[PDB]
Task: structure prediction
Amino acid sequence: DQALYAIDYIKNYTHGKIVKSEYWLAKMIDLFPVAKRAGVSEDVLNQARELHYDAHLYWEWWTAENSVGFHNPDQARESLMTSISKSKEAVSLLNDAIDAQVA
Amino acid sequence: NLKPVDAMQCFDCHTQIEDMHTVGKHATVNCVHCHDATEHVETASSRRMGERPVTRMDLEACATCHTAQFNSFVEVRHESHPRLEKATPTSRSPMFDKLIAGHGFAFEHAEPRSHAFMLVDHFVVDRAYGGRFQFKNWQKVTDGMGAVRGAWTVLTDADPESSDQRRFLSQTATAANPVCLNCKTQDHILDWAYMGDEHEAAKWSRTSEVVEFARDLNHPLNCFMCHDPHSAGPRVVRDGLINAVVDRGLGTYPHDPVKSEQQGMTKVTFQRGREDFRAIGLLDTADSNVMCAQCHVEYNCNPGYQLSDGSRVGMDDRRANHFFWANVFDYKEAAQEIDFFDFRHATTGAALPKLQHPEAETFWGSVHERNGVACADCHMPKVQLENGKVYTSHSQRTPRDMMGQACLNCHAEWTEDQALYAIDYIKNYTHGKIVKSEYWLAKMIDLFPVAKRAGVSEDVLNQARELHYDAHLYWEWWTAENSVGFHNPDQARESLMTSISKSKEAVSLLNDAIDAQVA
Amino acid sequence: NLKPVDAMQCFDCHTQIEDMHTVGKHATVNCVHCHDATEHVETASSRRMGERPVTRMDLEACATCHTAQFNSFVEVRHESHPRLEKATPTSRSPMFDKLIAGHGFAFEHAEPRSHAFMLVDHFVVDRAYGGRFQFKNWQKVTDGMGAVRGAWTVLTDADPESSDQRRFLSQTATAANPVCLNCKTQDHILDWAYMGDEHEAAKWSRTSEVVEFARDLNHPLNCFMCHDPHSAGPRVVRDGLINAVVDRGLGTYPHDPVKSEQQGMTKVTFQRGREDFRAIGLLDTADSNVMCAQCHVEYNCNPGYQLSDGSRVGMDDRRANHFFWANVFDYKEAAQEIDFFDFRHATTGAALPKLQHPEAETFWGSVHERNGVACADCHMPKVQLENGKVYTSHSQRTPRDMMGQACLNCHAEWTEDQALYAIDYIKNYTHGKIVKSEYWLAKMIDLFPVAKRAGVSEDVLNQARELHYDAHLYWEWWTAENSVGFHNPDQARESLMTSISKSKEAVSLLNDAIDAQVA
Amino acid sequence: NLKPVDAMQCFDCHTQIEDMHTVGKHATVNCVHCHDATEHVETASSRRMGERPVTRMDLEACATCHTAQFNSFVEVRHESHPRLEKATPTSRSPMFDKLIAGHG
Ligand code: HEC
Ligand code: HEC
Ligand code: HEC
Ligand code: HEC
Ligand code: HEC
Ligand code: HEC
Ligand code: HEC
Ligand code: HEC
Ligand code: HEC
Ligand code: HEC
Ligand code: HEC
Ligand code: HEC
Ligand code: HEC
Ligand code: HEC
Ligand SMILES: [Ca+2]
Ligand SMILES: [Ca+2]
Ligand SMILES: [Ca+2]
Ligand SMILES: [Ca+2]
Ligand code: NA
Ligand code: NA
Result:
């Protein structure tokens, strides 16, 4: 029971970061149509697309990988926090650019 | 081996302790069990401490004579899933990230687990200390006894050379402050003035560097949080609770003055330099409702802002350590009473409250509470033995693990499966209303950017923000509260329906205003 | 609530206790936990007791600070079949009635059950008090905690107005005497002189009226039988054991002088006035082999007869309280040394010994004993907890209930089923030899009447009777002993084969002599 | 205790019931098990009901002769989770609220 509990600690923690990474990716993705329709520049959209590559990589690794972090818990944690960081950066970029078009 | 000291010599200077110790069930328990006071006795005067005696705060100080209670307490319930994030579709709050956006809980909010881990979990959670503190390795997460022996036996500090709150990992926050610790440990009971006010005799206060404070703390939920070590009698030590019940005259049962008088609390104050320093609350009865309410309440333990003008309320303000002592339907009034809110929503800009595990206030007025049932009856019952000396279980956990003693002794008409089914009926119903409340909150929240971009007036946005406060309160109470409605099913239902009503009103307001801008 | 007394005042007249109490792990445990001495202190001098202080012998005196050990001790093992007669085909000795004819055990000899019941079971067994004492009703047989609280809470006396040993039921015996009680209780520890010799300061002795003595006794296996209440250190209190080990110089391990020196006993005497009265044996180590050997030994605790001349040895004689402290192959010499036997066989007329549960003397020289294993390792191991403070189980029971802790910790090469299989191989083999020994004893016994009626000479009959002593000894050791060979399989085997050899020799002798009379 | 009624008297007005009851496996089951028709019989005519008879619709009307089937029927499957909302992520329709918006 103790060994199972140790497994589940890691998997539960990692899964929570997967879910949060997805929340932020989804929030970013859903800003792209708003930004395009608002007339945000291709330069800004391309900056956001570059961030999306990293946000995606540092999330999807872990949904693809079958151990839900157990095989390398510290790496999963660092990666998923990086994904969230990238998505947050993109969300801020896009929101500010949309807000500037509205104003 | 311990050698007894002359307690009469101590009592010559310590009359309050004499009065408690000589009369209670610890009258024969020598001071040496918990104090090393030799240099203190050599140096103290009538009213100056001299050299500080050592006081043991470890739970093993009690375990030599009360091994059964200690061992029960330190048990780890492995079925209580560890480090399980609430903001996931399979946990308590599937849309928590969207709803709580702007608050530090967005960084991590896990389900509770066994009491042994409270202090270590506080130290390591991603929202608390910027990731500064971690388990020494991922094996240590199982070690409840080790956590009890001391947090620093199982944790590491990323930088012992600095004492500032900062981020060591990217997606962490630094929400911890000294007030938090009062619901994780009382190792600081002799080093913290009542309420955490500034005091010349206090090492620590509300305004301390929390990383330095953390390093001085070791043990979870000390045995003496509920039991006076001198009299062995029932008590509370949590300042915020004593402040609500006694200082503010609200009573132990604010809705029931008779029960408050029968099951009351007496504030006892201890001085340093003939100035009030710290306080305890001696209970008339061994009332677990009030014992557990030291921590299982809605509270402030953080900086915030004023509802009136939006100005910052810092840790220095008394409001940074506050027990609202109010049920869900009295809470908005209680927050207005202190002119306080917690955060501004990141998307809507609404001033919002943050709700914390309000089990005590939820339980008030429920059928069980009105019938004289208390937390311990369901969560730490007497042990049933075919042959033996009865004692009280100290493994605070779900009644599902002990249904005979927790439920069926009262409910002789039910089998275990029937009682479980009754629990699940309430929890399933309540959870469905939580989920629906979240759906409507999320729908409303997502209209704010559309409305702002459409040029909807600030007057309309502010009307919607006022609705958001209520929609939020009447939802979040129930994701914060741990029983998923069981503690007060009718109240949960009324509250959650109120949340949905408020969100629907806001959605209609915003949709109509957007539609008017488009036309 | 208990109020502490001034222990230093006691110590002014009790230097012997002072020297034990101030040094051990009970230095902080006030006398009031176990003594009521107020009137004593008012009236005593250092040389005159004055009023006799009260001493508590109840086990609950220890349970308030040691609940885990107490509750473990009082557990009832329901799988240890109760009131199960050994003289049945499905128990230990299918032919016991034929073989033991002439002895009181023919009236009833049940298998042992849990320790909580030892005193009540002693009182109610059909061989002991003529049926005088009974459980209050047949429900009370389950009540281990009640028995521990006191025998007279669960039993009745058929005639409180008489104190003689008498038959109240037809098929009972009156074998109980005061020596028996020393292996059931030590409630009388301050009322019984060493060995039960006559003493001016003794209320009770070997020659007391056992029914009157019985009425003064309440508690089984007091905690202080193994632990000094003053020092908390390991000890024995049983006079017969101290007498064997110390007075007679045999040592704690008669077959191993080195181990005897390392794991020895110090006799401590207590005086009444200027006269030695009682004694204890402080152990060098917490050696359960010697603790359990207070009772789990072969003994005299009864009147008997001399081997030399057949004359009666009554309770007044020191031999009526005797630990032989001899293995099976030294026993005959040990009994010759004190010129003693127990009974004459009803059919054969042979002088025979009666053997009692000789676990201690059987365990000597076994592979486990020689490797430093002790009774507690298999029968009361440390408790293994995922999270908690370790303590020692005090539920003395078969290792089958706790194989992980009792066996597999040492035998990592085995699964539980494998270890059980190894136990059963020995017990099955040994039991088969017990049964065959009984077959041959019974065959011999049944030839005695045929030989007598055929006019076989008394010289031949006496030759056969001498063989009967040995055939009996080398069999009965193993029906008396509770492990069915497991404690010493090679010894059981050698002994039982010797029994069969002796019986076969007697059968041949008697058959030949009968045939010669017929011819 | 139930007392049987004269079914032939009922059948004089109730031919459809006669045709069904006399032929099936309830031919021996008297009307009193399910009907109290005394005032009805006193007042009915060939094709007017008169006073309405009482008809038992409770399932225990069948349980006296068919206890096994009744007891099986009334069993509660506790593993069939109660009051469990379908519009939740762990049930049947995680996005039900959005999709069914406008419906009760
Ligand atoms: C008078 C000369 C004293 C003697 C004798 C003892 N104590 Fe004391 N103690 C004394 C003072 C003036 C104070 C400060 C508080 C006050 O009442 O004014 C204390 C404080 C303590 C404490 C609290 C320590 C802390 O960290 O805050 C403890 C635990 C304590 N004292 C214990 C104690 C014991 C066990 C004594 C007998 C061995 C004892 N004290 C003697 C003054 C005097
Ligand atoms: C042995 C030297 C003890 C130490 C160390 C502690 N306690 Fe104790 N406690 C002890 C005794 C002998 C008793 C009385 C037992 C009885 O029923 O007579 C107690 C009692 C308590 C109680 C019950 C009090 C009541 O019902 O009024 C409690 C709650 C208790 N003890 C708690 C406790 C705590 C929390 C300890 C560590 C600070 C502790 N005890 C130490 C003996 C000993
Ligand atoms: C022998 C081949 C091993 C196997 C099989 C398993 N583990 Fe292990 N584990 C092993 C070692 C030598 C260590 C490091 C010990 C140290 O203190 O240096 C570990 C470590 C872990 C950890 C901690 C991981 C971390 O990053 O800190 C965990 C959670 C753990 N082990 C769990 C675990 C589980 C559940 C296993 C079965 C699937 C398992 N380990 C197998 C050695 C071996
Ligand atoms: C008493 C009024 C409390 C204050 C002040 C703080 N916490 Fe707390 N905490 C409390 C309880 C009763 C519980 C268990 C019930 C629950 O709903 O969780 C907790 C739990 C935690 C946890 C574990 C669960 C989690 O959210 O991850 C953590 C990590 C935690 N608490 C941290 C924490 C912080 C950082 C605080 C100050 C900002 C704080 N707590 C205060 C009771 C109380
Ligand atoms: C509050 C959250 C508690 C903490 C912390 C501890 N105990 Fe407790 N204890 C609590 C209750 C509600 C009760 C029962 C009161 C009633 O009358 O119903 C107890 C009781 C005890 C006792 C008395 C004997 C018994 O009933 O078991 C003792 C000796 C005791 N508690 C000891 C003890 C220890 C050693 C603790 C730290 C491990 C501890 N308690 C913490 C509530 C609370
Ligand atoms: C019985 C009538 C109860 C009383 C009195 C109290 N609680 Fe309770 N609680 C009860 C139930 C049936 C549940 C749900 C448990 C389940 O397994 O479904 C709970 C839940 C909690 C929890 C969370 C436990 C968990 O999920 O592991 C907590 C922290 C809790 N309750 C606290 C608590 C407090 C502090 C009480 C007194 C104010 C209280 N409960 C009373 C049943 C009962
Ligand atoms: C001298 C003035 C004494 C004081 C003070 C105390 N005790 Fe005593 N005690 C004293 C004597 C002379 C004796 C008799 C010794 C003898 O020769 O027989 C005793 C005896 C006891 C006993 C044993 C009684 C029995 O059953 O035989 C006990 C348990 C005892 N005393 C305890 C005791 C306590 C606890 C005291 C302090 C509260 C105490 N005694 C003081 C002399 C004196
Ligand atoms: C509380 C007031 C106690 C009473 C009553 C009894 N004992 Fe005790 N015991 C107590 C303490 C505080 C300790 C020391 C604990 C530690 O580890 O520091 C003990 C210890 C023992 C031991 C262990 C001794 C050793 O290892 O040297 C034993 C065997 C023991 N106690 C037995 C015991 C008996 C049999 C009691 C009834 C006569 C008894 N204790 C009462 C506290 C208290
Ligand atoms: C209710 C109709 C009962 C049934 C069913 C069982 N028992 Fe009973 N038992 C009952 C009573 C009223 C009494 C007398 C209680 C008293 O103290 O006056 C008993 C007694 C016993 C006894 C004691 C018999 C004796 O001669 O002393 C035993 C051993 C006993 N009961 C056991 C028992 C068993 C095992 C049952 C199921 C087979 C059982 N009883 C059923 C009432 C009722
Ligand atoms: C210690 C040297 C003992 C003496 C003296 C007496 N008994 Fe005993 N008894 C002792 C042990 C270790 C056991 C358990 C092991 C076993 O083989 O039974 C017992 C058991 C009993 C029992 C229960 C089993 C039974 O035989 O029915 C009874 C009724 C009993 N003992 C009675 C008894 C009598 C009457 C004694 C004096 C003649 C007597 N015992 C002395 C240890 C010792
Ligand atoms: C001899 C047959 C015993 C009797 C009677 C009691 N105890 Fe005991 N105890 C015994 C042993 C062999 C041990 C372990 C010693 C070792 O070092 O391996 C113990 C230990 C204790 C302790 C110490 C703590 C622990 O290890 O659990 C205590 C406090 C204790 N025992 C208490 C105790 C009580 C209360 C008893 C009556 C219910 C009792 N013991 C009887 C052997 C024997
Ligand atoms: C492990 C190496 C043992 C040691 C050391 C001692 N005993 Fe034992 N005993 C052991 C076994 C495997 C068995 C058979 C149990 C079974 O379930 O088959 C026994 C049996 C006993 C019994 C009878 C238990 C019963 O049948 O319920 C007694 C009374 C007993 N043993 C006593 C005892 C003594 C006093 C010991 C030290 C001198 C001793 N045992 C050591 C295994 C082991
Ligand atoms: C002719 C005088 C009748 C007699 C004799 C009985 N019934 Fe009747 N019944 C009669 C009529 C005209 C009607 C209305 C329907 C129709 O067929 O035209 C009925 C109706 C019933 C009903 C239905 C009642 C209802 O609530 O709708 C029942 C259950 C019924 N009748 C039963 C019944 C029984 C059991 C009789 C014998 C005791 C009986 N009826 C006699 C006319 C006549
Ligand atoms: C006793 C007076 C009965 C009452 C009341 C009800 N039923 Fe019955 N039923 C009864 C008998 C004697 C039989 C025949 C049994 C056989 O196999 O011979 C039946 C049969 C049925 C059946 C089976 C019919 C078939 O297979 O054709 C059914 C489905 C049935 N009964 C249902 C039923 C209902 C629903 C009742 C309440 C309205 C009811 N029965 C009452 C005897 C009795
Ligand atoms: Ca939990
Ligand atoms: Ca709050
Ligand atoms: Ca047995
Ligand atoms: Ca003998
Ligand atoms: Na020695
Ligand atoms: Na452990």
